[PDB]
Amino acid sequence: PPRDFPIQRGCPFAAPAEYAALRTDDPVARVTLPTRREAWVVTRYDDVRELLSDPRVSADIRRPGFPALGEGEQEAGARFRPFIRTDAPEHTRYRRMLLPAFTVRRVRAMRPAVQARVDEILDGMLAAGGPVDLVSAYANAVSTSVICELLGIPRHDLEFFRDVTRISGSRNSTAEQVSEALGGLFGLLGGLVAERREEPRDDLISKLVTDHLVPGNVTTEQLLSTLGITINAGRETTTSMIALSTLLLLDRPELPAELRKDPDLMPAAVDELLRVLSVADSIPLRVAAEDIELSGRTVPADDGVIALLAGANHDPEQFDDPERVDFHRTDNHHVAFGYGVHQCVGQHLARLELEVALETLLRRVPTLRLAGERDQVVVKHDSATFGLEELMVTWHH
Ligand code: HEM
């Protein structure tokens, strides 16, 4: 019988053991999604790049072969799906709209603003003390806070409002109250959107409002939709990397020891931590417009395929000793942010966010240790991007 795709990984810090077999044996294996439908899954680095790189592959959720892992997920085509699940002139229309907002030069500038926000998060968290959940306390704190800097949301006036709404917005509580929260988040944005319309600053909203909304390229509804979309793409995952990356540093003290000895590696370490952890893994799902050949096998057309970044980012044909977190890796051409047209737009921020968030903690909370018992750590079992759900830490007062 075709194997059920989603595999619970035993080791948090690495790809599921099944993958190695998949690379060597089944490069293009057939699996059964939780919806009991079938799809193909690619585990090889070189194949993942050709597969995502190929223009014979589409990200349309409308295709009935789409590999949705959710029951009504595929029924997004009948409805209006987000732009990240489209291809053609549609996909490029929004993605290419917000690229100038995310360039390296733009991100290099927020380096001081991003630092200050992170330090503030540390002060309060440091002042209060007590064992606290890093995932809630820090990882998310930075994530949410950094998006405000990019988005243009006022910090003090808001942030608190905003921090909570996102949390409520996604979760398993108050089925009726979600409407209330999304209304808050959306109401907040609308005001900013409208406000920037008059006398706008250097934010994504400003860039979008005065570059596309004002000349009529996007309807106000449209601008709002994407703004919300990028928040989802950049929140759950970024916080997941900080919390998960942080456990690895705690589990192996040999590693942060290196960072302290050489603080220059930090940017390099952020990249290695991305490939070794490979939090996204199953995120990019695509369908074959016409048959595509990879390795020995070929996937028929109109069939759903999933590119496993975790399988790719651990492939030894690319990474010598891929299971060793070597901060000195000679060749880190990882795909943690995907490959191709749909490659992450926030990679630069995620990196600056990750570097600033991780460094500042090692420096500011050196004493930091894990308050909860190890082996008691809880890894999300219901997520798109693998991550921890609770982490408890303390430090010397
Ligand atoms: C934890 C660090 C991150 C990782 C590992 C990551 C990973 C990815 C991956 C694998 C994709 C492609 C999914 C697909 O095939 O459709 C993607 C897309 C995207 N990411 Fe991220 N991401 C991260 C952080 C962020 C941040 C901080 C932002 C900004 C809020 C962001 C914004 C986006 C957007 C807008 C897309 C859609 C690109 C498109 O298809 O046009 N990401 N990301």
Name every residue whose Cβ is closer than 8 Å to that of residue 394 and which is 6 or more positions away in sequence: 130, 131, 132, 368, 369, 371
Is residue 273 within 8 Å of residue 245, measured between CB atoms? yes
Q: 274 in helix, strand or coil?
A: helix
Tell me the best of 58, 270, 345 to mutate to test the pocket of ligand 1, counting ligand atoms within 8 Å of each CB and taking the most.
345
Find, among 235, 319, 241, 238, the residue nearest to 277 by Cα.
241
Q: 336 CA to middle of ligand 1, Å?
A: 9
Q: Is 177 left (phi over 0), alpha (psi -120 to 50) or beta?
A: alpha
Task: Name the residue ranges covered by the structural domains of the chain.
Answer: 1-397
Residue identifier of the C-alpha nearest atom 17 of ligand 1: 344
Known binding positions: 91, 95, 286, 342, 344
CA angle, corner 27, sides to 22 and 31, nearest 5? 70
Is residue 39 within 8 Å of residue 45, measured between CB atoms? no
Q: 144 CA to middle of ligand 1, Å?
A: 15
DSSP label at residue 209:
I
**Residue 56 CA: distances (Å) to CA of 59, 233, 394:** 10, 25, 51
Q: 343 CA to middle of ligand 1, Å?
A: 7
- Report d(CA 29, CA 297) in Å as an integer: 9
Residue 392 burial by Cβ neighbours in a 10 Å radius (0-12, 13-18, 19+): middle
Is residue 227 within 8 Å of residue 151, measured between CB atoms? yes
> Which amino acids bring their CB within 6 angstroms of ligand 1?
84, 95, 147, 230, 233-234, 237-238, 241, 279-280, 283-284, 336-338, 342, 344-346, 349-350
Q: Tokens in use for 200? A: 């706008």
Is residue 107 within 8 Å of residue 348, measured between CB atoms? yes
Is residue 341 within 8 Å of residue 84, measured between CB atoms? no
Find, among 16, 10, 45, 7, the residue nearest to 320 by Cα.
45
Tell me the best of 344, 352, 386 to mutate to test the pocket of ligand 1, counting ligand atoms within 8 Å of each CB and taking the most.
344
Q: Tokens in use for 41? A: 């899954």
- Report d(CA 271, CA 243) in Å as an integer: 15
Q: 376 in helix, strand or coil?
A: coil
Q: 150 CA to middle of ligand 1, Å?
A: 15
Alpha helices by DSSP H, listed for 252-392, are 254-261, 266-277, 309-312, 347-364
Q: 179 CA to middle of ligand 1, Å?
A: 25
Taken as a whole, the chain contains a residue count of: 397
DSSP string computed for 145-205: HHHHHHHT--TTTSSHHHHHHHHHHSSSS-TTHHHHHHHHHHHHHHHHHHHHHSS--SSHH
Phi first, then psi: what are they for 345, rounded to 5°?
-100, -15
Helix, strand, coil shares of the chain, percent, nearest 5, are 50, 10, 40
Elucidated via? X-ray
Q: What CATH class does 1-397 carry?
A: mainly alpha
Phi first, then psi: what are they for 278, rounded to 5°?
45, 60
Q: Tokens in use for 345? A: 């737009």
Find, among 354, 364, 358, 351, the residue nearest to 124 by Cα.
364
